[PDB]
Amino acid sequence: ISNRLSNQISGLNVATRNANDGISLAQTAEGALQQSTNILQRIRDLALQ
Amino acid sequence: ISNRLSNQISGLNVATRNANDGISLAQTAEGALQQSTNILQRIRDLALQ
Question: Of A10, A43, B11, B35, which one's alpha carbon is 20 to 30 angstroms from that of A16?
Answer without folding.
Answer: B35
